[PDB]
Amino acid sequence: VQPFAAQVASLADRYEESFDIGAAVEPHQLNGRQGKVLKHHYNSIVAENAMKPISLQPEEGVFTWDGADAIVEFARKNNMNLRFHTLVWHNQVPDWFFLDEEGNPMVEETNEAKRQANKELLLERLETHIKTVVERYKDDVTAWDVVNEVVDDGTPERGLRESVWYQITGDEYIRVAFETARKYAGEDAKLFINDYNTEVTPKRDHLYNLVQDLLADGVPIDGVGHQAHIQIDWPTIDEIRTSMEMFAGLGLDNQVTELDVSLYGWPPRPAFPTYDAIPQERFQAQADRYNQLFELYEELDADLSSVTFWGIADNHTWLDDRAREYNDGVGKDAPFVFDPNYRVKPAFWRIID
């Protein structure tokens, strides 16, 4: 019988001299023993979904603040830091951004000069969206994911992701997003570029050259968010260390923003059907990995300000959707230090020590 997580020592207190300890949350997870476990173990939170562009501005000029407000309210109640995820992304972003005035998709425009019109129109919509979102939460947010996932995985030229944003504006939306965010959040606000697989080449190198570029042009960036959607055996600790040291070497702060330690490889196949189908030895392999990982975080704590998990406990993780995707609709992952009943797992004991 592993104990309920309210009966164990605080992760946040354990790491207070090194970095914040954060969780992604939905608004329905903010009371009960969920809320109690949150208050006790975390001193930072982020919205898993409620602050994404489609959750905030689903139609032009139409802002839906209720979910994000609840999260903002919760962090304030419990004296927690707050990350904003995210001002710019290529998913969970409303379609109206990318349509011209006649209502046709900007990406299908073949007239080069009409494409320049579409560049300017889109950038002003971006600017307006950031301006409005940032105004409301400027006093509460402690770190902004200004752009998310703007670097691509392969292509060893520049390696920028050719989402709709890039197809329409090239790299200019990245510049505008950071410059707008600075103007409205304040000179002290901490502006992040956030991404997954930052640990491995060439993606690592593409992200490095992109932030190097933006810093060269006076674009205000303060840190790199490492999503750290990682596995048990990959990437190596030295790849993680090299990655964070490399971005620190550009005068950037590092944050670990979306940490989950999947029980599977990539792709996550074959998968366990239920949580209680998972053998105990996998939980011990996950704990071993967590230990090495947090020993590295502590080692790098001069350049690492916050470590946020992409969830609370194993009852709710986006990795189930990925497991289900590659295993014919059936599959459970288990990436956290707390299990589906909010009981501690072996990994908890290995990072609380």
Query: Exactly one of 69, 213, 288, 301 binds Na ion (CB under 5 A); which one?
Result: 301
Q: How far is the CB of 275 from Mg ion (least distance, A)?
A: 24
Structure tokens at 31: 């009371």
Our CB check for Na ion shows the closer of 286 and 305 to be: 305
Structure tokens at 84: 């904003």
Q: Is 109 in the site for Na ion (CB under 5 A)?
A: no
Query: Exactly one of 187, 188, 233, 353 binds Mg ion (CB under 5 A); which one?
Result: 353
Q: How far is the CB of 14 from Mg ion (least distance, A)?
A: 10
Q: Is 247 in the site for Na ion (CB under 5 A)?
A: no
Bridge partners, 4 (sequence order): 343
Residue 353 annotated as part of some ligand binding site: yes
Our CB check for Na ion shows the closer of 287 and 307 to be: 307
Q: Is 298 in the site for Na ion (CB under 5 A)?
A: no
> Per residue, what are the HEC states of the chain?
CCCEHHHCCCHHHHCCCCCEEEEEECHHHCCHHHHHHHHHHCCEEEECCCCCHHHHCCECCECCCHHHHHHHHHHHHCCCEEEEECCCCCCCCCHHHHECCCCCEHHHCCCHHHHHHHHHHHHHHHHHHHHHHHHHHCCCCCEEEEEECCECCCCCCCCECCCHHHHHHCCHHHHHHHHHHHHHHCCCCCEEEEECCCCCCCHHHHHHHHHHHHHHCCCCCCEEEECCEEECCCCCHHHHHHHHHHHHCCCCEEEEEEEEEECCCCCCCCCECCCCCCCHHHHHHHHHHHHHHHHHHHHCHHHEEEEEECCCCCCCCCHHHHHHHCCCCCCECCCCCECCCCEECHHHHHHHC
Q: How far is the CB of 344 from Na ion (least distance, A)?
A: 25
Q: How many CA atoms lie within 13 A of 108 on its CB side?
A: 6
Query: Exactly one of 161, 291, 298, 325 binds Mg ion (CB under 5 A); which one?
Result: 291
Q: Is 310 in the site for Na ion (CB under 5 A)?
A: no
Our CB check for Na ion shows the closer of 134 and 244 to be: 244
Q: What angle do CA 216, 239, 85 make, to 5 degrees?
A: 60
Q: So which residues are the catalytic ones?
A: 258
Choices 75-83, 110-118, 286-294, 314-322 (CB under 5 A): range interacting with Mg ion:
286-294
Given Na ion, Mg ion, none, residue 291, with its beta carbon under 5 to 8 Å by kind, binds Mg ion
Given Mg ion, Na ion, none, residue 353, with its beta carbon under 5 to 8 Å by kind, binds Mg ion
By CB under 5 A, the count of residues binding Na ion is: 3
Q: How far is the CB of 2 from Mg ion (least distance, A)?
A: 17
Closest residue to Mg ion: CB criterion: 291
Our CB check for Mg ion shows the closer of 89 and 348 to be: 348
By CB under 5 A, the count of residues binding Mg ion is: 3
Given Na ion, Mg ion, none, residue 310, with its beta carbon under 5 to 8 Å by kind, binds none
Q: Is 19 in the site for Na ion (CB under 5 A)?
A: yes
Q: How far is the CB of 43 from Mg ion (least distance, A)?
A: 19
Binding-site residues for Mg(2+), in ranges, read 18, 291, 301, 304, 350, 353
Binding-site residues, in ranges, read 18, 291, 301, 304, 350, 353
Residue numbers of the site for Na ion (CB under 5 A)? 19, 301, 305
Residue numbers of the site for Mg ion (CB under 5 A)? 291, 350, 353
